[PDB]
Design an enzyme around this catalytic site. Structure first.
Site, PDB file in Angstrom:
ATOM      1  N   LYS B  70       0.820  -1.215   0.000  1.00 24.52           N
ATOM      2  CA  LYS B  70       0.000   0.000   0.000  1.00 24.52           C
ATOM      3  C   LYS B  70       0.856   1.268   0.000  1.00 24.52           C
ATOM      4  O   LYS B  70       0.705   2.149   0.848  1.00 24.52           O
ATOM      5  CB  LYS B  70      -0.982  -0.006   1.176  1.00 24.52           C
ATOM      6  CG  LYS B  70      -2.158  -0.945   0.972  1.00 24.52           C
ATOM      7  CD  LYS B  70      -2.906  -1.216   2.264  1.00 24.52           C
ATOM      8  CE  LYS B  70      -4.085  -2.143   2.014  1.00 24.52           C
ATOM      9  NZ  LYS B  70      -4.714  -2.611   3.277  1.00 24.52           N
ATOM     10  N   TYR B  89       2.944  10.545 -20.481  1.00 30.03           N
ATOM     11  CA  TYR B  89       3.609  10.169 -21.719  1.00 30.03           C
ATOM     12  C   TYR B  89       2.752   9.152 -22.460  1.00 30.03           C
ATOM     13  O   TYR B  89       1.786   8.608 -21.920  1.00 30.03           O
ATOM     14  CB  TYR B  89       5.031   9.640 -21.469  1.00 30.03           C
ATOM     15  CG  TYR B  89       5.152   8.348 -20.685  1.00 30.03           C
ATOM     16  CD1 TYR B  89       5.263   8.358 -19.300  1.00 30.03           C
ATOM     17  CD2 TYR B  89       5.208   7.122 -21.335  1.00 30.03           C
ATOM     18  CE1 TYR B  89       5.399   7.175 -18.582  1.00 30.03           C
ATOM     19  CE2 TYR B  89       5.346   5.938 -20.629  1.00 30.03           C
ATOM     20  CZ  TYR B  89       5.441   5.967 -19.253  1.00 30.03           C
ATOM     21  OH  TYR B  89       5.580   4.784 -18.555  1.00 30.03           O
ATOM     22  N   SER B 256       2.318   4.903   3.070  1.00 31.36           N
ATOM     23  CA  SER B 256       1.128   5.724   3.269  1.00 31.36           C
ATOM     24  C   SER B 256       1.181   6.467   4.598  1.00 31.36           C
ATOM     25  O   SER B 256       0.817   7.647   4.672  1.00 31.36           O
ATOM     26  CB  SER B 256      -0.126   4.853   3.190  1.00 31.36           C
ATOM     27  OG  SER B 256      -1.299   5.634   3.331  1.00 31.36           O
ATOM     28  N   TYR B 525     -30.436  14.041   7.444  1.00 29.70           N
ATOM     29  CA  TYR B 525     -31.612  14.881   7.651  1.00 29.70           C
ATOM     30  C   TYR B 525     -32.292  14.563   8.976  1.00 29.70           C
ATOM     31  O   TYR B 525     -32.529  15.456   9.798  1.00 29.70           O
ATOM     32  CB  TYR B 525     -32.600  14.686   6.499  1.00 29.70           C
ATOM     33  CG  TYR B 525     -32.191  15.311   5.186  1.00 29.70           C
ATOM     34  CD1 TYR B 525     -31.706  16.611   5.130  1.00 29.70           C
ATOM     35  CD2 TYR B 525     -32.306  14.603   3.998  1.00 29.70           C
ATOM     36  CE1 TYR B 525     -31.342  17.185   3.928  1.00 29.70           C
ATOM     37  CE2 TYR B 525     -31.945  15.167   2.793  1.00 29.70           C
ATOM     38  CZ  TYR B 525     -31.463  16.457   2.762  1.00 29.70           C
ATOM     39  OH  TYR B 525     -31.105  17.018   1.560  1.00 29.70           O
ATOM     40  N   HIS B 594     -30.936  15.870  -4.945  1.00 25.22           N
ATOM     41  CA  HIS B 594     -29.902  14.848  -4.963  1.00 25.22           C
ATOM     42  C   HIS B 594     -29.935  14.107  -6.295  1.00 25.22           C
ATOM     43  O   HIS B 594     -31.001  13.881  -6.872  1.00 25.22           O
ATOM     44  CB  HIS B 594     -30.093  13.866  -3.806  1.00 25.22           C
ATOM     45  CG  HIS B 594     -29.888  14.472  -2.451  1.00 25.22           C
ATOM     46  ND1 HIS B 594     -29.715  13.710  -1.315  1.00 25.22           N
ATOM     47  CD2 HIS B 594     -29.833  15.764  -2.049  1.00 25.22           C
ATOM     48  CE1 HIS B 594     -29.560  14.506  -0.272  1.00 25.22           C
ATOM     49  NE2 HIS B 594     -29.627  15.757  -0.690  1.00 25.22           N
TER      50      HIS B 594
HETATM   51 FE   LIG Z   1       6.969   3.249 -18.523  1.00 27.65          FE
END
Ligand SMILES: [Fe+3]
Lengths: 566, 688
Positions: B70, B89, B256, B525, B594
């Site tokens: 991760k 690219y 992370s 709500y 919504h």
């Molecule tokens: Fe590449």
């Protein structure tokens, strides 16, 4: 309202068409020359899902509407139809053809600046490719696989540089300018076999409710002197679909042979699939013919196609099982006779002028194209796989003051013949509608709160009977006896009491002597019931609607429908 | 201590050692070096805290993002020039100019690849050639189909013992033959082009810029052509029209959490300044000695662009490329089923359960994905793991700012009801009224002195709950510190330690407080209204229909039963208060309905499924309530507001700006100038 359960891609139709795209080839912006380096205003014009035209009416009537659209744009140009190509197929209820014009002597659509530079320039060509259908099938082959044969048309987008170096459309397999300035069309295919350019094959499995098919292009053959020089079929699309009612939905996929072999000729136009973007239906009373359409994922191809057909072993016990019921009995009434009402198998939806309009509890008004306005009132919330009611079509052009004429209809989706119980007895209760005729008139609203319309049938014995009360008991009512249900539906006999009550003025009695009753079971395990009472011959619903086995006429009509409880 | 860079090859360690000395010479941010044998070994080392960063191709960014690693990209290589920089690219196929074949008719030829599982080298070309490979599918490796497709090829990194056909065109002078290293002369972008220049193969799957950096001038580049997906051959210069895919640049990835993100960017920023392009005489950070290809960075790269923290591997690669990599290990049958189905995204476990009921009755047209928060669900559809979801107007702004489009709108009761509507799908939407609700006993409560009280909100960034009220208060103060508009609040989605969450009560155990889904009892709500009904707050910001549906026995919950509509009033923009029924004259602002949002590539299929499902399970459907209901049923306010009658068409307002309206969108972005919004900062990077 409108068709509220489908997109323009998967919408059921009795006819659909697409108009020829024409890209803007102008080299000027609305002020000055094209900043793009020697480009044109619109070098790629794909098809649009919102430009799909939906048709209504007979086969001839649908074609004339498309011809009118072309004739509305150009004064007196000749319109070319596919009637010559369709001759070899001898279709009876379907068409997969084209209407177009070359706009002889007509300049291009142009819009210029005040200085003179033109910023809009579209070829004055115009055309359609379409499919049309009549009499959507109410009964289908019971089982097995059925081979269908036919043809197909297509229409592509407009792309300026297919090969990247400004080649002629003839080199790519189409008439000049086709595919470059306008969409490439099947009716201008140049590298196909003139004997049969675009044959189509189908294989429908009614056991598994699945459809397979091939859209094929017969490639060009050099020598036309030999009438039986071998064909060169090339599969372009592979068709897969699943059946629902008398219609089907599925996908179209470009064959790998096109991708790998004809990479530089055919793959330039057939390169993207139509995944879950194909739909169609069966036409003719017994599913004799089929027609459908598709549009690819990137809106590069819009195709239409058509097809025609080439005891107790299994469900095939007569080769025809009723799939749905949709009939009407045509203020003073109209011609007292029955007639099949076009439908796709959706009881709470009414197919009027190509679009499916939803049916609500009661008393809704919908407006027609010609100017006549029809108001309908269908039956009740408890019935879900069968609907009854009536409608009156009125043309409100007679300007008075303050405040086909009246028809009774029956709609429902049948139960599978291998879904009707063969054991036990069941009770149904519902409502019924009735009209008297031309002499002293008596209407009876279907209520479910004032009409009883009780029924009982022993599925083990097939002895359906019942009564539909009006005031109290069955004295002012009809009695239905001698059931003998048959396969998907049933047929009975109609009798009343000593008389019928309408209102010493003139007690308006009504008499009936063993009239004909016919009907069927609708939905799941025979959830509901419905039928009609009429007298012209042995010509009604129930048995596959062949209208035989008689013979006198009269003017009276009553339609019923009921749901079961225990 | 310092930044530990990971080197995947013996020469990359030497340049990294050169890098360490030069940084110490200029007294810059320190960088140490750790040596491993492959990029995957570097990814594993980073996860073990034995290393911190490594440059990675997009094909290995995907690998770094998988469990349990991760790793997320933190800095993207920048190509081009300083005045025309680009972070993407093009994957291209380069061939000799002698025509005679296209991208489809290349079976039995000889191919040159940069390396196994690389973006332009492997993933993009094999993905587009799959229909011609006759591959049996997973779990059988696709290399067998490729090794049988081409006559022979050089695929650096391929298993030489099991697919020797994938290595026969390399020349490593020994056991360095099929090496994932610069010791193989045909290795990288540059290496694979040599395999074509030498004549070993007839096609090289490389970058669009290899020819410009390896061929001297515009005399030898005219010997080579490009293969476009439309099966045409075009000159090299037109790679923008004759590319196989547009893909993101190679990126530096790190952990992370505790990934030294600040130090890594600080190191790369100063190295670019000192040893970048056209800089200090010796030791250019990009490009390095004889026969070596892309040591620690792409050669002729100019610098880096910092990646916002929210971006993970899936978001960085984009949905098109992310699913393409995933499809390479899904069966051909599985790929079609995914494209034909609608993957709904649920917010919270409760919404996930309702979706799972729906999926079993959708006849294979709806499946389910789950995210903890609404912004997370937006990221899921952004990555392609999800397809659709119904969003409040405020979240529609976020999804629209990220490229998603509205598809269908939640239709409520019209301004002229007259019936249950059959043409509801074609009935244009009319919005809903956002109101401020107070207990009628508190007669000193007016809109002129609402600040400093206790407030209840549906959730942060929502229309009636947050955007409309706070926008009105911001339009008169200019204060960005929304945690000080009220003394205490329950605004689900805020900092749990903040006082904006001090009023939330969490689930029945008291945990998951201020979480922005149904688990928090004051969410939404009805949750915000309950927060007012239980005297937690003084004012609740909901829509007016919420009070009507949760009073006078219309709701049989204990907190709502015995609640009378007469005990509540609305704060109008006067200072006067009016009963809830008069909200048409005592509302704060009109709120757009919504709406369901999705990617543009899924709109048509999504319309098909939803228009059919709501015919079966919508209000007044065939199978509702007997089997299932999408709308108010045994479930309340999950996946759809209970006041929804149908999902209606948008009448052309198919973009978030067109749908939400010009003035409402302008108001939201005014408030967003105060906030960070990690998801928005991620999408601002992506749409660039
Ligand atoms: Fe590449």
């Amino acid at each position: 309202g409108s068709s509220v359960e489908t997109t323009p891609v998967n919408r059921p139709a009795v006819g659909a068409a697409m108009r020829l795209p024409r890209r803007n080839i102008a080299s000027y912006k609305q002020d000055g020359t094209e900043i793009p380096d020697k480009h044109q205003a619109e070098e790629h014009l794909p098809l649009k899902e919102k430009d799909i035209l939906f048709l209504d009416g007979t086969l001839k009537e649908q074609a004339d509407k498309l011809k009118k659209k072309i004739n509305e744009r150009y004064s007196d140009v000749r319109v070319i139809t596919s009637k010559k190509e369709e001759e070899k197929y001898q279709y009876q209820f379907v068409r997969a053809g084209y209407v177009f014009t070359r706009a002889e002597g007509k300049d291009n659509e142009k819009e210029k600046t005040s200085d003179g530079k033109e910023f809009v320039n579209r070829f004055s060509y115009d055309g359609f490719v379409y499919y049309s259908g009549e009499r959507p099938s109410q009964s289908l082959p019971s089982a097995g696989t059925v081979q269908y044969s036919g043809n197909w048309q297509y229409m592509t987008d407009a792309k300026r540089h297919r090969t990247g170096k400004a080649v002629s459309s003839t080199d790519l397999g189409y008439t000049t300018y086709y595919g470059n300035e306008i969409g490439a069309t099947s009716y201008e295919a140049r590298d196909a076999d003139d004997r049969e350019k675009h044959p189509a094959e189908y294989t429908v499995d009614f056991d598994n409710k699945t459809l397979n098919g091939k859209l094929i292009k017969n490639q060009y053959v050099q020598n036309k002197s030999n009438p039986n020089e071998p064909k060169k079929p090339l599969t372009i699309y592979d068709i897969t679909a699943t059946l629902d009612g008398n219609r089907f939905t599925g996908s179209a996929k470009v064959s790998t042979e096109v991708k790998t072999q004809h990479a530089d000729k055919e793959y330039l136009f057939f390169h993207t699939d139509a995944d879950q973007r194909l739909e169609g239906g069966f036409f003719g009373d017994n599913g004799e013919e089929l027609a459908g359409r598709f549009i690819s994922n990137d809106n590069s191809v819009f195709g239409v196609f058509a097809g025609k057909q080439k005891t107790k072993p299994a469900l095939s016990s007569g080769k025809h099982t009723k799939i749905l019921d949709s009939l009407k009995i045509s203020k003073n009434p109209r011609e007292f006779a029955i007639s099949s009402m076009p439908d796709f198998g959706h009881p709470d939806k009414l197919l009027v002028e190509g679009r499916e309009i939803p049916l609500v509890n009661k008393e809704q008004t919908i407006e027609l194209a010609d100017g006549r306005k029809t108001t309908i009132r269908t039956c009740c919330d408890f019935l879900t796989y069968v609907k009854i009611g009536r409608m009156q079509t009125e043309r409100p052009a007679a300007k008075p003051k303050a405040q086909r004429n009246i028809d009774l209809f029956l709609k429902g989706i049948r139960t599978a013949e291998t879904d009707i119980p063969k054991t036990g007895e069941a009770h149904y209760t519902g409502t019924w509608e009735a009209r008297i005729g031309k002499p002293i008139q008596w209407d009876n609203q279907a209520d479910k709160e004032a009409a009883k319309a009780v029924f009982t049938v022993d599925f083990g014995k097939k002895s359906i009977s019942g009564t539909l009360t009006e005031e109290n008991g069955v004295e002012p009512a009809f009695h239905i006896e001698n059931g003998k249900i048959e396969g998907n539906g049933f047929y009975a006999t109609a009798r009343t009491r000593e008389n019928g009550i309408n209102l010493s003025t003139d007690p308006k009695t009504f008499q009936a002597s063993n009239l004909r009753v016919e009907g069927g079971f609708y939905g799941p395990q025979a959830e509901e019931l419905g039928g009609i009472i009429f007298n012209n011959d042995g010509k009604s619903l129930g048995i596959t609607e062949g209208t035989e086995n008689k013979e006198v006429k009269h003017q009276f009509g009553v339609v019923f429908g009921a749901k079961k409880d225990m | 201590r310092s930044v530990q860079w990971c080197a995947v090859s013996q020469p990359e360690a030497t340049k990294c050692f050169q890098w360490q000395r030069n940084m110490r010479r200029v007294r810059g941010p320190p960088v140490s070096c750790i040596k491993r044998d492959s990029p995957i070994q570097c990814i594993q080392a980073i996860a073990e805290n034995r290393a911190d960063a490594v440059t990675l191709d997009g094909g290995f960014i995907y690998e770094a993002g998988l469990a349990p690693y991760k790793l997320r990209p933190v800095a993207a290589e920048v190509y081009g020039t300083e005045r025309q920089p680009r972070t993407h690219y093009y994957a291209v196929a380069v061939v000799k100019k002698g025509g005679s074949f296209q991208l489809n008719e290349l079976q039995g030829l000889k191919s040159c690849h940069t390396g196994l599982r690389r973006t332009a080298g492997w993933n993009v070309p094999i993905g587009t050639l799959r229909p011609f490979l006759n591959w049996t599918g997973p779990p059988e490796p696709i290399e067998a189909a490729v090794a049988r497709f081409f006559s022979a090829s050089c695929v650096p990194g391929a298993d030489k013992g099991q697919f020797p056909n994938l290595c026969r065109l390399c020349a490593g002078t020994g056991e360095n033959k099929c090496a994932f290293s610069s010791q193989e002369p045909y290795f990288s972008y540059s290496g694979a082009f040599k395999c074509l220049r030498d004549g070993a193969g007839d096609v090289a799957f490389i970058r669009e810029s290899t020819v410009f950096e390896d061929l001297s001038d515009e005399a030898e580049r005219d010997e080579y052509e490009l293969l476009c997906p439309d099966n045409t051959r075009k000159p090299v210069d037109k790679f923008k029209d004759c590319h196989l895919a547009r893909v993101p640049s190679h990126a530096v990835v790190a952990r992370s959490v505790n990934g030294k993100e600040d130090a890594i960017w600080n190191l790369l920023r100063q190295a670019q300044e000192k040893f970048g392009k056209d800089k200090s005489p010796k030791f250019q950070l990009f490009g390095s000695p004889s026969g070596q290809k892309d040591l620690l960075f792409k050669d002729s790269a100019i610098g880096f662009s910092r990646v916002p923290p929210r971006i993970d591997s899936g978001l960085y690669l984009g949905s098109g490329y992310f699913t393409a990599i995933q499809n390479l290990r899904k069966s051909e049958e599985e790929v079609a089923a995914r494209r034909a189905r609608v993957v709904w995204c649920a917010v919270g476990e409760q919404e996930l359960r309702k979706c799972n009921q729906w999926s079993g009755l959708s006849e294979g047209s709806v499946t389910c994905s789950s995210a903890s928060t609404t912004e997370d669900c937006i990221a899921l559809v952004l990555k392609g793991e999800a397809d659709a979801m119904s969003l409040d107007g405020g979240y529609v702004y976020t999804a629209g700012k990220c490229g998603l489009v509205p598809v269908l709108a939640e239709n409520y009761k019209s301004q002229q009801s007259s019936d249950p509507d059959p043409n509801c799908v074609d009935r244009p939407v009319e919005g809903y009224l956002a109101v401020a609700v107070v207990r009628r006993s508190d007669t000193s409560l007016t809109w002129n002195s609402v600040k400093g009280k206790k407030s209840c909100h549906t959730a942060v960034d929502r229309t009636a709950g947050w955007n409309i009220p706070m926008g009105l208060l911001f339009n008169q103060t200019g204060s960005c510190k929304f945690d000080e508009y009220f003394s205490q609040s329950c605004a689900p989605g805020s900092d749990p330690r903040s006082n904006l969450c001090a009023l939330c009560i969490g689930d029945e155990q008291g945990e998951n407080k201020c979480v922005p889904n149904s688990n928090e009892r004051y969410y939404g709500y009805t949750g915000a209204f309950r927060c007012l009904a239980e005297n937690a707050g003084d004012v609740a910001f909901v829509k007016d229909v919420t009070v009507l549906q949760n009073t006078d026995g219309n709701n049989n919950d204990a907190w709502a039963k015995d609640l009378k509509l007469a005990d509540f009033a609305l704060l109008c923009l006067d200072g006067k208060r009016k009963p809830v029924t008069e909200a048409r004259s005592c509302h704060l602002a009109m709120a757009p309905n919504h709406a369901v949002v999705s990617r543009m590539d899924k709109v048509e299929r999504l319309k098909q499924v939803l228009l059919h499902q709501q015919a079966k399970f919508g209000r007044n459907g065939s199978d509702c309530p007997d089997k299932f209901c999408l709308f108010q049923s045994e479930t309340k306010n999950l996946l759809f507001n209970d006041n929804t009658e149908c999902l209606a068409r948008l009448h052309g307002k198919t973009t978030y700006e067109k749908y939400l309206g010009p003035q409402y969108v302008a108001g939201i972005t005014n408030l967003k100038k105060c906030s960070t919004s990690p998801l928005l900062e991620a999408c601002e990077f992506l749409r660039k």
